[PDB]
């Protein structure tokens, strides 16, 4: 039950300052050392700064150097990234992690990550559209969740007991600079009449929460 | 500076395999420093997690079917007997430097048997028509290898540069791939016409596979 | 009570072995790294080897790569030193140190230091003799114990059983044609405490398992 | 390989001086690559104890008036006002490489004010003569500067080659030395002469200073 818990990730504008937060449990941050790594949509791992909590003592990589701080409270155990003069290119998904015992320059537990989206754009929730299955077999159906910024949403079925058989799609950007992804499932083709399938969308960034259900279309 | 540059770029093996990947250090470094090496495996939507540090100790609860060894400035990580699960992006990481650095990464994916796609096609919703838009969605489920193409047609006519695809991550456990096509419309161009197909070419299917639906039946 | 103390030095002849040890308390050393260091006579110090004992990761100076070998026994909180095929250049003050904390790259703690004498010579133990106050310069008089012929390095020696250390001077060893050691060990005390305070000079050679308690006094 | 030169090997100054120890990697090396130079002061006797550490950071107890910094690949130790408890050999060590190499070190002396030796001579005791040997000692307690001759003649005979001295390091109070001279003969030689004698000479005795005793007195 060591752990690392980020928060405080989000939308910002360019020029904007975002702080974030890394909680440690089960271990004190003054024993050792805590990292930040990030990782821009698609792209590879790129390490961000460290701090030994106990002395202070804290290095960046070049890229950051002036705009971001890493600093500790020790008495809350928790890390801060502060970062100032944001640009799009700082946009990614921002990790925390430790080095553990004296085993340096190995990271051994990392946080889950918090997302870091910069840009102008609005807020925007989705809507969202069934896709009904069509006419002994299996059938499939889903859900199109359409027009939302920024990422991420989540999709889960029947309030998580459906999850076999389920694909939520990477979302694609649209031309209009909105996401929309797709969550299907395949189900047997003799369930749909008696069996209730409905796609719970999160979308955390609007506070929009939809559960759709989805069955057959009549004619 | 001092880089690492892993290869290959990415690689497909079979269960079983043994697989290997390579990081180089970007110029020639003095013996007397040293780089304690680490490696981490990252899936899709998850942090990296550790599996060798200082070269070739293998970090705890990581299994066995890993290793890692370093001679001079090229360093290797194998695993021994690839399972399904370790699809996945694999970085070193190098520590002559402050800041230490990452590889670039090798994405691995598991060869498995042909597998054709199940294919669906679904028209736009009512209540998507009532907007102005309309989505028309072909799903191709669980098929490899991920190579695909999806044609789109309306009334006959191929449609270009009006569809975007998304395919999902390769399944950690039948080690397939599903992917959707999107096809948009204006409403009143949707309601223009009758006959909405894709077409899927995949090397599990024999000729290429059309599923389509006139709009309005049933 | 962070501490390391060192064991196992002294003779051993060119070509021996020794093995040493540092034991330590007031932390673990699963928790972190341990190294020696060493100095020879009259020189400057030489790092040896490091260990993490928690994997046992080892790497070793040049100089003793092949003949030296650090290792750690986490269950006794122990780490030592093997050194094999010893010559004259590996006599030398021996410290165990470590790594505190996360704080990397700095030996916060160090023993005492044990010294391996790398000779062909046989040990040989001390006689302590008295330097009896006759001597006096104001109200000061002077008086120490003079350790003479021993082999090997070191001797130590304290007044009163640690009592006493103000005006102590313990000269460095010297080395007699006879290729034996000898050290004086004085200390100034006020003439009028003569009568009636007692010195003792506690002198102890381990290497011949020598300890000897002193007293010295005005002469008849 | 990669190696500190420190500088300079030894220096001497008064307390209440500035004194700069200076370390440098003996090559151009990578500002990508960390040294982490750490400083050790290592007194007479005793283990070396850490002062500083990453090149600048204070050790946990350290007195303030040390200090270091690195700029490239220099590295420097200050000490903003020296005290007499600060006579000490000064070692550098960078961390670039592994194994890490320590700098050949640096000795600083104290300078103070010239303080001329107390006497005191002593008879070889008569526990030794039994053994065959007499041992003559003479001290020289508390001096500065540490220049000193000591001459030893037996009924006027000057001898030479037949003792040894031993000078212990500079106090850490006081900043004096002490040393001892020992006159070696054969029981039956002690036996045939009287008068044992030390003459010391030193900057701080305006004339030198004889110690004798007779032997059987
Ligand atoms: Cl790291
Ligand atoms: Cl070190
Ligand atoms: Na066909």
């Known amino acids: 039950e060591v752990q690392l818990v980020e928060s405080g990730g989000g939308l910002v504008q360019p020029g904007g300052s975002l702080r974030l937060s890394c909680a440690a449990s089960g271990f004190n941050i003054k024993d050792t050392w805590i990292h930040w790594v990030r990782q821009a949509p698609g792209k590879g791992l790129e390490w961000v700064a460290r701090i030994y909590p106990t002395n202070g003592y804290t290095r960046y990589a070049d890229s950051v150097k002036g705009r971001f701080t890493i600093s500790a409270d020790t008495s809350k155990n928790t890390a801060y990234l502060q970062m100032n003069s944001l640009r799009a290119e700082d946009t990614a998904v921002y990790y925390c992690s430790r080095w553990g015992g004296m085993m340096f320059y190995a990271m051994d537990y990392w946080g889950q990550g918090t997302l870091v989206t910069v840009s102008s754009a609005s807020t925007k929730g989705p809507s969202v559209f069934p896709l009904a299955p069509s006419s002994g077999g299996t059938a499939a159906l889903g859900c199109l969740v359409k027009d939302y910024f920024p990422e991420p949403v989540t999709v889960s079925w029947n309030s998580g007991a459906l999850t076999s058989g389920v694909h939520t799609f990477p979302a694609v950007l649209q031309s209009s600079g909105l996401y929309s992804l797709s969550s299907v499932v395949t189900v047997p083709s003799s369930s749909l009449g008696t069996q209730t399938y409905i796609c719970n969308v999160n979308h955390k960034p609007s506070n929009t929460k939809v559960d759709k259900k989805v069955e057959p279309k009549s004619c | 500076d001092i880089q690492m540059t892993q290869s290959p770029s990415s690689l497909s093996a079979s269960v079983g395999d043994r697989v290997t990947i390579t990081c180089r250090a970007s110029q020639d470094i003095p013996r007397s420093i040293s780089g304690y090496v680490a490696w981490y495996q990252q899936k899709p939507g998850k942090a990296p997690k550790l599996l060798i540090y200082?070269?070739?100790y293998l970090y705890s609860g990581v299994p066995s079917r890993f290793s890692g060894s370093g001679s001079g400035t090229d360093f290797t990580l194998t695993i021994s007997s690839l399972q399904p699960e370790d699809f996945a992006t694999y970085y070193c990481q190098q520590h002559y430097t402050t800041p230490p650095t990452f590889g670039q990464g090798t994405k691995v994916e598991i060869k498995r048997t042909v597998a054709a796609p199940s294919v669906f096609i679904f028209p736009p919703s009512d209540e998507q028509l009532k907007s102005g838009t309309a989505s028309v969605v072909c799903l191709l489920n669980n098929f490899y290898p991920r190579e695909a193409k999806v044609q789109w047609k309306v009334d006959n006519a191929l449609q270009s540069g009006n569809s975007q695809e998304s395919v999902t991550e390769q399944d950690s456990k039948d080690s397939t791939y599903s992917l959707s096509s999107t096809l948009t419309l204006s409403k009143a161009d949707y309601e223009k016409h009758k006959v909405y197909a894709c077409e899927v070419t995949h090397q599990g299917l024999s000729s290429p596979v059309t599923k389509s639906f006139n709009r309005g039946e049933c | 009570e962070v501490q390391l103390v060192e064991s196992g030095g002294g003779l051993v002849q060119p070509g021996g072995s020794l093995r040493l040890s540092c034991a330590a308390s007031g932390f673990n050393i699963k928790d972190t790294w341990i190294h020696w260091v060493r100095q020879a006579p009259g020189k400057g110090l030489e790092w040896v080897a490091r260990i993490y004992p928690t994997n046992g990761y080892t790497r070793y100076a040049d100089s003793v790569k092949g003949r030296f070998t650090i290792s750690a026994d986490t269950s006794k909180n122990t780490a030592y030193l093997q050194m094999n095929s010893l010559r004259a250049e590996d006599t030398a003050v021996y410290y165990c140190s470590r790594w505190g904390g996360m704080m990397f790259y700095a030996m916060d703690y160090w023993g005492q230091g044990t010294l391996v004498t790398v000779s062909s010579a046989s040990t040989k133990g001390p006689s302590v003799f008295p330097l009896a106050p006759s001597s006096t310069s104001g109200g000061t008089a002077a008086l120490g114990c003079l350790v003479k012929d021993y082999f090997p390095e070191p001797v130590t020696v304290s007044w009163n059983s640690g009592a006493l250390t103000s005006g102590v001077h313990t000269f460095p060893a010297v080395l007699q044609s006879s290729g034996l050691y000898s050290l004086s060990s004085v200390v100034t005390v006020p003439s009028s405490s003569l009568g009636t305070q007692t010195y003792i000079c506690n002198v102890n050679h381990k290497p011949s398992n020598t300890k000897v308690d002193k007293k010295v006094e005005p002469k008849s | 390989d990669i190696q500190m030169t420190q500088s300079p090997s030894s220096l001497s100054a008064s307390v209440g001086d500035r004194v700069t120890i200076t370390c440098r990697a003996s090559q151009d090396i990578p500002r990508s690559i960390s040294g982490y130079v750490a400083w050790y002061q290592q007194k007479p006797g005793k283990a070396p104890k850490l002062?500083?550490?990453?090149?600048?950071?204070?050790?946990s107890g350290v007195p303030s008036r040390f200090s270091g910094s690195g700029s490239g690949t220099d590295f420097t130790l200050t000490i903003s006002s020296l005290q007499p408890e600060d006579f000490a050999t000064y070692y550098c060590q960078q961390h670039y490489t592994t194994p890490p190499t320590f700098g050949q070190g640096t000795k600083v002396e104290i300078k103070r004010t010239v303080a001329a030796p107390s006497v005191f001579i002593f008879p070889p005791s008569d526990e030794q003569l039994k053994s065959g040997t007499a041992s003559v000692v003479c001290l020289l307690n508390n001096f500065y500067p540490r220049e000193a001759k000591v001459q030893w003649k037996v009924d006027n005979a000057l001898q030479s080659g037949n003792s040894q001295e031993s000078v212990t390091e500079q106090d850490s109070k006081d900043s004096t030395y002490s040393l001892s001279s020992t006159l070696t003969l054969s029981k039956a030689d002690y036996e045939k002469h009287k008068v044992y004698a030390c003459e010391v000479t030193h900057q701080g005795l305006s004339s030198p200073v004889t110690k004798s005793f007779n032997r059987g007195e």
């Open positions: 200082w070269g070739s």
